[PDB]
Tab-separated table of C-alpha atoms in Angstrom:
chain	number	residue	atom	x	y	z
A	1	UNK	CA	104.023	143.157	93.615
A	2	UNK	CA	107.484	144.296	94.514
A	3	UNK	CA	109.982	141.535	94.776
A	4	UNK	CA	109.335	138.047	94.130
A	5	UNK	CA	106.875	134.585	94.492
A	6	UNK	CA	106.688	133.356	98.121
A	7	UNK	CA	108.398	129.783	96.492
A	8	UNK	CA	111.645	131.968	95.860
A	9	UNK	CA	111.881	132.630	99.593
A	10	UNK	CA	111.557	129.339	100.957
A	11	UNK	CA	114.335	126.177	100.976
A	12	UNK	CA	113.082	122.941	100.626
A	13	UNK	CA	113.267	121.309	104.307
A	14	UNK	CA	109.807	121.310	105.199
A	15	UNK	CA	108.374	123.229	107.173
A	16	UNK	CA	108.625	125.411	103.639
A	17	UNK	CA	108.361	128.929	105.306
A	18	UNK	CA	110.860	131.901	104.779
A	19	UNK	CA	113.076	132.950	106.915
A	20	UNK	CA	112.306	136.640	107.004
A	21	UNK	CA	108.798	135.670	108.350
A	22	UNK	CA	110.476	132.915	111.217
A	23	UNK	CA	112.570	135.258	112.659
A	24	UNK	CA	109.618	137.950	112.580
A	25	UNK	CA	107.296	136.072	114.311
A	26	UNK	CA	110.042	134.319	116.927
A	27	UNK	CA	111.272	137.892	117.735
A	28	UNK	CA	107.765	139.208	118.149
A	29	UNK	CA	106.762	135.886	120.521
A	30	UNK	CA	109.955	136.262	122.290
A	31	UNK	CA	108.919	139.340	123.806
A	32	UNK	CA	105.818	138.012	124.970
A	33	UNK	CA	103.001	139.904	123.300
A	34	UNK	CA	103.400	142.608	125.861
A	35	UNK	CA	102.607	145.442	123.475
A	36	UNK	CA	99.584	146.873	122.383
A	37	UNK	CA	97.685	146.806	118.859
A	38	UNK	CA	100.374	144.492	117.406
A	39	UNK	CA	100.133	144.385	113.806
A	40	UNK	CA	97.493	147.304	113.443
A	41	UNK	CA	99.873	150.170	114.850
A	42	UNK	CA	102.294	151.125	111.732
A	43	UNK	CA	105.990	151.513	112.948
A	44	UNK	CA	107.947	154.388	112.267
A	45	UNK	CA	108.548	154.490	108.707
A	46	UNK	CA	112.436	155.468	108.505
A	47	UNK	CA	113.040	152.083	110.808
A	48	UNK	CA	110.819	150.197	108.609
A	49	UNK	CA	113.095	151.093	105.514
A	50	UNK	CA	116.314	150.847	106.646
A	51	UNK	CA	115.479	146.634	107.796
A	52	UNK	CA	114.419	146.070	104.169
A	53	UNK	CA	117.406	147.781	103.641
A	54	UNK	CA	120.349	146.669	106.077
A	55	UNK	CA	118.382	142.989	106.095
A	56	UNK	CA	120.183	141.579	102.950
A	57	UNK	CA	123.383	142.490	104.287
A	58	UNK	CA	123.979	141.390	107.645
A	59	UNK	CA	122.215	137.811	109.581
A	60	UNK	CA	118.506	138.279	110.656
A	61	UNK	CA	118.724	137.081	114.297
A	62	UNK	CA	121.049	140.101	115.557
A	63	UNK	CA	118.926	142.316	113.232
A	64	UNK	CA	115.732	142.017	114.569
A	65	UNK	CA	116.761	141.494	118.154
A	66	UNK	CA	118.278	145.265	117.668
A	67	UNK	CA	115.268	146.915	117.108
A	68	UNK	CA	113.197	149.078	119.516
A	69	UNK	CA	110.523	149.554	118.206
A	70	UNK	CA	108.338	145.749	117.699
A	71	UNK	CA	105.892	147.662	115.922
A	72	UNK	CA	108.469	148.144	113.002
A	73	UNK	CA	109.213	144.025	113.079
A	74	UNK	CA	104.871	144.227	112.157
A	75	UNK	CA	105.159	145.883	109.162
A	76	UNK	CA	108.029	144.257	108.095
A	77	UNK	CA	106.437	141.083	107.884
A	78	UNK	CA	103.307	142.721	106.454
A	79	UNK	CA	104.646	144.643	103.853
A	80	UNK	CA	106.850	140.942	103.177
A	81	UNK	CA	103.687	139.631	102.913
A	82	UNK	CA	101.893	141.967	101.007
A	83	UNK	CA	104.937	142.364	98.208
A	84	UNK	CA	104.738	138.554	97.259
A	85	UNK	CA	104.179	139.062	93.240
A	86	UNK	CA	101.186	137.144	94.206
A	87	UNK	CA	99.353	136.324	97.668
A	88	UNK	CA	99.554	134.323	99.784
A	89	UNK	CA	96.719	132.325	99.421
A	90	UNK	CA	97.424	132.403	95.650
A	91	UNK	CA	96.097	134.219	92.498
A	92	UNK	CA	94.186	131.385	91.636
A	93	UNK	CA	92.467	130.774	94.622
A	94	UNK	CA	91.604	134.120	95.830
A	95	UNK	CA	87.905	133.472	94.318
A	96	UNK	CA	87.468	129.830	96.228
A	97	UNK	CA	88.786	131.210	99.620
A	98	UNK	CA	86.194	133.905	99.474
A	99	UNK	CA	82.897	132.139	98.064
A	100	UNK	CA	84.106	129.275	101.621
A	101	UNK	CA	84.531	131.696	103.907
A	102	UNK	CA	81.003	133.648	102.616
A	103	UNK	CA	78.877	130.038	102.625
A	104	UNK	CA	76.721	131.084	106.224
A	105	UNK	CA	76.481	127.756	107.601
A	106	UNK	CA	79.750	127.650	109.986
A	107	UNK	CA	80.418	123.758	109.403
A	108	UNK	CA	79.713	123.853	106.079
A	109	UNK	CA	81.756	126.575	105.324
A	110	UNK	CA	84.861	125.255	107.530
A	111	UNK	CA	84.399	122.210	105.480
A	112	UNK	CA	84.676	124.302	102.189
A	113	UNK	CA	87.888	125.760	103.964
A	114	UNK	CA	89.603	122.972	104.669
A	115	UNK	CA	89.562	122.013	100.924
A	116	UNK	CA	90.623	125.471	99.408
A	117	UNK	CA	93.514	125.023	102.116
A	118	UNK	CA	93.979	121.487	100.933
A	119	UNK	CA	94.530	122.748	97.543
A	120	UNK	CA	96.749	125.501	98.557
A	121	UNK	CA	100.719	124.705	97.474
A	122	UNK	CA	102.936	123.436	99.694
A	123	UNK	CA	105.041	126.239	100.571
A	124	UNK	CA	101.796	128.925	101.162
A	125	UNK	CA	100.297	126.252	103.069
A	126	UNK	CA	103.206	125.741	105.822
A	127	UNK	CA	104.093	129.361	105.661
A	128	UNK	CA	99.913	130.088	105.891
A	129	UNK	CA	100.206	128.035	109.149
A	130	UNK	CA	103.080	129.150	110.618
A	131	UNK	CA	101.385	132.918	110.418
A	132	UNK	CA	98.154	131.163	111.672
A	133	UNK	CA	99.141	129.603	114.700
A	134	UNK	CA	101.248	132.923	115.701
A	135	UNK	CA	98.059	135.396	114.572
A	136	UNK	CA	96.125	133.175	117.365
A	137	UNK	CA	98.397	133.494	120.061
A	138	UNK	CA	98.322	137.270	119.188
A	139	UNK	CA	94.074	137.499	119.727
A	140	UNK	CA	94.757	135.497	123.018
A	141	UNK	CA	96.901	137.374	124.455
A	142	UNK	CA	94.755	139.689	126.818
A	143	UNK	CA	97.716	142.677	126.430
A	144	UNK	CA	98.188	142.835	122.235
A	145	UNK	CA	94.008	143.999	122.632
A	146	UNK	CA	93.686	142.685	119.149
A	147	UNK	CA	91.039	139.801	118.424
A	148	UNK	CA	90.212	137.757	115.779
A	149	UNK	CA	88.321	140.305	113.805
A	150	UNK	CA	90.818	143.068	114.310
A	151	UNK	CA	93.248	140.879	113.160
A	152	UNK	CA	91.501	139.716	110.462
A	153	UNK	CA	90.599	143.288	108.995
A	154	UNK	CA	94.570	144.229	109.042
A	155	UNK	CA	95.623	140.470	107.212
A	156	UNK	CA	92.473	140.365	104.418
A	157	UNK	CA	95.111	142.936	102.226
A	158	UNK	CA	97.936	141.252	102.948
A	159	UNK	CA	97.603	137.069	102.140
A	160	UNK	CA	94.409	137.368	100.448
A	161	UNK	CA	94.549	140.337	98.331
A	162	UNK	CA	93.006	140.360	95.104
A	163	UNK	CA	93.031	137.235	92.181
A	164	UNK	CA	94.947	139.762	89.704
A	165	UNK	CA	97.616	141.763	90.017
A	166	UNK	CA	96.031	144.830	88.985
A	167	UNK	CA	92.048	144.850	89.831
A	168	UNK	CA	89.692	147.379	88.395
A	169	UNK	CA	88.566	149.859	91.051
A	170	UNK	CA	84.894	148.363	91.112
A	171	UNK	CA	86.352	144.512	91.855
A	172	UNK	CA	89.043	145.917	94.145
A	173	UNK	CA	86.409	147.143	96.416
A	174	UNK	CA	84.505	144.272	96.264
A	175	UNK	CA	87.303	142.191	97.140
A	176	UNK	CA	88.568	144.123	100.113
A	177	UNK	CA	85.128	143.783	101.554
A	178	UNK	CA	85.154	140.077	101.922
A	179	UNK	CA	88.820	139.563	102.579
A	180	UNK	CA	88.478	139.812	106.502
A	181	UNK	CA	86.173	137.009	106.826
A	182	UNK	CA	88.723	134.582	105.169
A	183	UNK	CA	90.773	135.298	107.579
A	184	UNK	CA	88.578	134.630	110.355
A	185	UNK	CA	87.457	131.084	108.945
A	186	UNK	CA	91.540	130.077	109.170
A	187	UNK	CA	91.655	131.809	112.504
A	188	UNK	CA	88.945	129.143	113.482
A	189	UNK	CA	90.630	126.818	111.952
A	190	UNK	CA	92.011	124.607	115.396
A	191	UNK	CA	95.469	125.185	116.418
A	192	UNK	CA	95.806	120.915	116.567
A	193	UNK	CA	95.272	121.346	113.084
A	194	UNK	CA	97.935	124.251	111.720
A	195	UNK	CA	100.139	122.390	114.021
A	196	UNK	CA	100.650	119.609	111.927
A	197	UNK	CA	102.337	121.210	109.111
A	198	UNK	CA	105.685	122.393	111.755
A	199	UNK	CA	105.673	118.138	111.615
A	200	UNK	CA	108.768	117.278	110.183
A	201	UNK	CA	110.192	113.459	109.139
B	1	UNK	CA	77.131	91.259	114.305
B	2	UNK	CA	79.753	90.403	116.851
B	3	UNK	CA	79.815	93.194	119.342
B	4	UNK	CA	78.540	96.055	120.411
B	5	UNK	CA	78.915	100.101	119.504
B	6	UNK	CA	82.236	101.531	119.226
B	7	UNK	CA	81.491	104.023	121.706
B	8	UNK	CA	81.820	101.060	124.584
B	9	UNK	CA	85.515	100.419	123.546
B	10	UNK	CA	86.410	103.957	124.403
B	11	UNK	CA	86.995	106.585	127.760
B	12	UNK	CA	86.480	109.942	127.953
B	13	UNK	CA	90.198	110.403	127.366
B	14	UNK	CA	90.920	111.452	123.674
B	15	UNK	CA	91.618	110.611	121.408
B	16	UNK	CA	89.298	107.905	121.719
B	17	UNK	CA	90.476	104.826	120.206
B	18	UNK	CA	90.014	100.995	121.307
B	19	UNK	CA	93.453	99.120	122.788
B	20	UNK	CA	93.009	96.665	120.048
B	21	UNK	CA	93.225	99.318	117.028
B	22	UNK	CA	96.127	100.832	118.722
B	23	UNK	CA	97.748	97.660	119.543
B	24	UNK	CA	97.205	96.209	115.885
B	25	UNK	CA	98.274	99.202	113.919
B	26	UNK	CA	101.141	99.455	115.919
B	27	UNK	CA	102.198	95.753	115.826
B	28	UNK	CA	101.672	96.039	111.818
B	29	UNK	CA	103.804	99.243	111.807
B	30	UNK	CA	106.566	97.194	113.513
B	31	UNK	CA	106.651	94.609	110.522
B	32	UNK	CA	103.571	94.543	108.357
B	33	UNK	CA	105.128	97.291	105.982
B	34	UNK	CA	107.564	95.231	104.631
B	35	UNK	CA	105.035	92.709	103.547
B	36	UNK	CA	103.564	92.354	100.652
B	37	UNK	CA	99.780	92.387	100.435
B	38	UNK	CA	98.843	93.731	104.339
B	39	UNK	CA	95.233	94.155	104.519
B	40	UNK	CA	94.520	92.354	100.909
B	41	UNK	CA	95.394	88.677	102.360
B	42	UNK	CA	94.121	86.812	104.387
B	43	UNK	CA	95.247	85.052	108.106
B	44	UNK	CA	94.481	81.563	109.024
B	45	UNK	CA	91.467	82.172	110.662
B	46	UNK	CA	92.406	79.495	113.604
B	47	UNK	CA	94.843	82.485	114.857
B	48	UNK	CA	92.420	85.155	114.762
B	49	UNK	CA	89.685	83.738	116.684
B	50	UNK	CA	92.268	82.800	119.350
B	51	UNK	CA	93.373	86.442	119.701
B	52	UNK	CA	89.784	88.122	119.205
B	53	UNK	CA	89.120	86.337	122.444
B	54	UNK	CA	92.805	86.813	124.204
B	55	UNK	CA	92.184	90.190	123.835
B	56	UNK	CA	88.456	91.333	124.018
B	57	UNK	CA	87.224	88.231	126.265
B	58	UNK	CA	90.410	88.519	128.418
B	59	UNK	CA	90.268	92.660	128.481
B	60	UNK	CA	94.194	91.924	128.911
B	61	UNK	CA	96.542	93.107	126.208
B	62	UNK	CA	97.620	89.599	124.408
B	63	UNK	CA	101.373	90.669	123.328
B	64	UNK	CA	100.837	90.742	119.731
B	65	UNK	CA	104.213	90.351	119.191
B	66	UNK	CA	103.878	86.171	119.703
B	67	UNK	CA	101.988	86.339	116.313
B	68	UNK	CA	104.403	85.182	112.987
B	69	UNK	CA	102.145	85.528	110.641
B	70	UNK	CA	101.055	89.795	111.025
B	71	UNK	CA	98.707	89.191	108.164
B	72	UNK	CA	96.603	87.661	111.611
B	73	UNK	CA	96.568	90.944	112.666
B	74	UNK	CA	95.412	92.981	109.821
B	75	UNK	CA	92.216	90.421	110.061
B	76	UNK	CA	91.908	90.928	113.337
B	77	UNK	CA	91.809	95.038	113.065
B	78	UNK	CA	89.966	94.621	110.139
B	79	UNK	CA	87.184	91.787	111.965
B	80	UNK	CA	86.723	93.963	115.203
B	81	UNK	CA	85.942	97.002	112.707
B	82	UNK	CA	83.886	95.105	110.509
B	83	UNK	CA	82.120	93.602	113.083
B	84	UNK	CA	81.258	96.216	115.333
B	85	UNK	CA	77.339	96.794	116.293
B	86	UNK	CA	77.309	99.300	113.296
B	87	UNK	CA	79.980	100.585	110.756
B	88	UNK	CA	83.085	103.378	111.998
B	89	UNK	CA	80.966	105.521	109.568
B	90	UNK	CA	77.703	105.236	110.906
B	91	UNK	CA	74.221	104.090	109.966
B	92	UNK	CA	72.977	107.581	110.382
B	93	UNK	CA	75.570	108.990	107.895
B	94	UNK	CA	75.836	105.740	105.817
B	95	UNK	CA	74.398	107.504	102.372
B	96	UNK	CA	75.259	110.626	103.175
B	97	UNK	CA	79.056	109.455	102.680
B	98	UNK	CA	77.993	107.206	99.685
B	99	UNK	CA	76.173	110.527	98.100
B	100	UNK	CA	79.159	113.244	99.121
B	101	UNK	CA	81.828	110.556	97.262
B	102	UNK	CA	79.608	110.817	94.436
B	103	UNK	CA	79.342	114.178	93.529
B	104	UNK	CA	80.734	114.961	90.080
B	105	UNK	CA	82.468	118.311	91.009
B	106	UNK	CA	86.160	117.418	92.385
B	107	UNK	CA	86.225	120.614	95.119
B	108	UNK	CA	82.651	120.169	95.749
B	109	UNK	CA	83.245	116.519	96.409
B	110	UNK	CA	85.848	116.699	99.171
B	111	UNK	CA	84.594	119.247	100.503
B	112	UNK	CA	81.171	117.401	101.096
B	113	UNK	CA	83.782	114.465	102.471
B	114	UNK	CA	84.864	117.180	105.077
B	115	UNK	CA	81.284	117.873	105.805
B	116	UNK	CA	80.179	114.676	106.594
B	117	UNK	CA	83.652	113.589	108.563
B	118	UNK	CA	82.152	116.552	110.783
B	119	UNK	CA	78.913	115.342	111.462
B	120	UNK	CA	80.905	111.743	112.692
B	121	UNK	CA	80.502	111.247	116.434
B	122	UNK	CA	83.782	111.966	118.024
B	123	UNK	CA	84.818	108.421	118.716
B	124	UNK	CA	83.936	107.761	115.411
B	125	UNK	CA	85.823	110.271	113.682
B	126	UNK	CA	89.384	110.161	115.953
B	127	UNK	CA	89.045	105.789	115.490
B	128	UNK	CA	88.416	106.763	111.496
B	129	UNK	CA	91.335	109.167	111.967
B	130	UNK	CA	94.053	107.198	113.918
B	131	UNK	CA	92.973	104.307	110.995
B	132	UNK	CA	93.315	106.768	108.242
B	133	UNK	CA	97.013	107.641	108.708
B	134	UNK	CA	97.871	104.412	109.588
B	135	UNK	CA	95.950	103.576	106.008
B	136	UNK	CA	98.218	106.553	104.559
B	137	UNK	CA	101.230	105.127	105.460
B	138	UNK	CA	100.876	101.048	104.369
B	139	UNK	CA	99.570	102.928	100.945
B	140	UNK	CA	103.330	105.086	101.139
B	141	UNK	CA	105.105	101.712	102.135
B	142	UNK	CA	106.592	100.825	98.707
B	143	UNK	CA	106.975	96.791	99.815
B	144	UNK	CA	103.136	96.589	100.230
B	145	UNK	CA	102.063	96.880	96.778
B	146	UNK	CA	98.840	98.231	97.966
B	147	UNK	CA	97.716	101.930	97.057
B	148	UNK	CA	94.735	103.953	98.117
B	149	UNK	CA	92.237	102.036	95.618
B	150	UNK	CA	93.941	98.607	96.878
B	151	UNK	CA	92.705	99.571	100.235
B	152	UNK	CA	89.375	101.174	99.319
B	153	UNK	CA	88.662	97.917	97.834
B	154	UNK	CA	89.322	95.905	101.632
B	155	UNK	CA	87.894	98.708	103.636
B	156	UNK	CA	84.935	99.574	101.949
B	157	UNK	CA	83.124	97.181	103.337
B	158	UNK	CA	84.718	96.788	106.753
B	159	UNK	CA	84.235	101.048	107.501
B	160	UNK	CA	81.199	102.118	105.477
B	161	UNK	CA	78.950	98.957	105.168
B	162	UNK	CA	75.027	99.498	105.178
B	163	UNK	CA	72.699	102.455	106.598
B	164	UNK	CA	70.638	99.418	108.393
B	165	UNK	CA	71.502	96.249	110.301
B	166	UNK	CA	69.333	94.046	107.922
B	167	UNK	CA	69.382	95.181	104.086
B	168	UNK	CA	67.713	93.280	101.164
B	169	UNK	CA	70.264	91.667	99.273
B	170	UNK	CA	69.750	94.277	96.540
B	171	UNK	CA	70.744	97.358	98.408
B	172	UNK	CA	73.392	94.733	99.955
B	173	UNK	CA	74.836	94.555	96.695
B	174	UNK	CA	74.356	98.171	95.351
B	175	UNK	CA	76.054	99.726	98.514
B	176	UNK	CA	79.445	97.258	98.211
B	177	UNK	CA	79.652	99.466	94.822
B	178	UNK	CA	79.630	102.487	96.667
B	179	UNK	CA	82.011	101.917	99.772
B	180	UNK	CA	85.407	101.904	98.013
B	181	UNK	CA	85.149	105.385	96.645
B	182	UNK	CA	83.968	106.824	100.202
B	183	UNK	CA	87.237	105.264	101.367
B	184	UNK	CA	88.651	106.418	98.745
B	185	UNK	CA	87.906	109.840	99.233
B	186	UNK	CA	89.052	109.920	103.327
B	187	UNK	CA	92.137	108.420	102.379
B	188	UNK	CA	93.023	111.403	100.236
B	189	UNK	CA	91.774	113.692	102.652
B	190	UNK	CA	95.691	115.047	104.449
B	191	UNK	CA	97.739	113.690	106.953
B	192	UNK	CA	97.581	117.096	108.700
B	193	UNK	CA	93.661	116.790	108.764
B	194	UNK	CA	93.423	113.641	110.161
B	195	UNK	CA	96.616	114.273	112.630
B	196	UNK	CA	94.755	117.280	114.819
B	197	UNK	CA	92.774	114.828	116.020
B	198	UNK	CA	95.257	112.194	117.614
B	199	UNK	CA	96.678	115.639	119.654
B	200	UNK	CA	96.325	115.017	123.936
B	201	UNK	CA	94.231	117.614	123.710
């Protein structure tokens, strides 16, 4: 939507994840997921700018590290996220993410999961995993008072989205309502299993 | 034929996986990738009955590493498999491989592959796992000159074999014409899918 394909962030030493969304996630970890409503509280909006701003001029590390506010780190991942010219999970595989994750049988549908993930490119895939495994240790921590489901409702806009760029306000509505339980099927999906995509040989 | 259920050559401790699968895929790693033909020829069988006793009669690991000829080994792996009370697939969930393989639709397919890999019982499916990657690799390794279809070929009948101990030599035959694409099918299935299940837990 804003700025560019997730592929144009990433180098090509797997794990294929950007950098903007490692040092994110490592800052928010590194404060041990002390605060509360991670991810669902917005962070004030003028700190929020300026990193989008001041991040393409000086390192990453020292900026994030800097700010006060962790809240602010949240939406600056998010709104990376969200201003991928396509989602996460891909354009054309919105559809197949939602019809798995709405098949009611659980191990059918995790089976149907692990495929649309299998078919996801290389790059979303270890970057999907990456924000997986961190989005679990988020619902588990017993002070961020966020679950699965919370967490789930604030991600279905952001890496699932819509399969067009510009959805008619009947589909867009339609979509949004079956975006959260996509994320909850990769939630479920075993941390053993996103794990093996930070392999690297 | 020759021995009992898988389930006896396994603890509690996961992943469960007999000594002599471990110790064979990891004496073939050593120097069965740089030959030619591993799995697809065959050892003098003089040395494998030897070892088949030296290591299941003797419950004492027989260092593998005494054998010259590793092709020995890959007919050992593949003779304890193959001979095992019933196939590392199952009787139970002998067609219902056979059938998933065979479904027309590509996504649909796999994804009924990931179905039925989840109805495996546990030592089955970690065994099937550990055997997978180490299938992945020999099929990466290019000295072999074996790919996934080489190896669907060999295993087909040593993994998914018949739904009953004694078949009629018709549904004998028609099966061995449906094994190599069920092997076919796991072996495309991702290292990262088969990999959560080798992790300590």
């Amino acid at each position: 939507i804003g700025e560019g394909m997730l592929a144009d962030f990433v180098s090509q030493t797997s794990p294929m994840i950007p950098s903007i969304v490692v040092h994110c996630v490592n800052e928010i970890e590194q404060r041990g997921l002390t605060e509360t409503g991670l991810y669902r509280i917005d962070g004030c909006d003028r700190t929020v700018k300026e990193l989008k701003e001041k991040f393409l001029r000086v390192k990453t590390v020292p900026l994030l590290s800097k700010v006060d506010d962790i809240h602010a780190i949240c939406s600056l991942l998010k709104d990376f996220l969200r201003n991928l010219k396509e989602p996460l999970l891909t354009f054309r595989l919105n559809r197949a993410f939602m019809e798995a994750a709405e098949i009611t049988d659980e191990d059918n549908s995790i089976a149907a999961m692990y495929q649309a993930v299998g078919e996801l490119p290389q790059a979303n895939r270890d970057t999907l995993a990456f924000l997986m495994i961190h989005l679990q240790r988020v619902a588990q921590s017993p002070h961020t008072k966020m679950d699965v489901a919370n967490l789930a409702k604030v991600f279905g806009p952001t890496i699932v989205a819509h399969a067009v760029p510009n959805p008619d306000p009947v589909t867009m509505s339609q979509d949004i309502k079956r975006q959260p339980k996509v994320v909850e099927r990769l939630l479920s999906l075993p941390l053993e299993y996103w794990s093996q995509f930070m392999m690297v040989e």
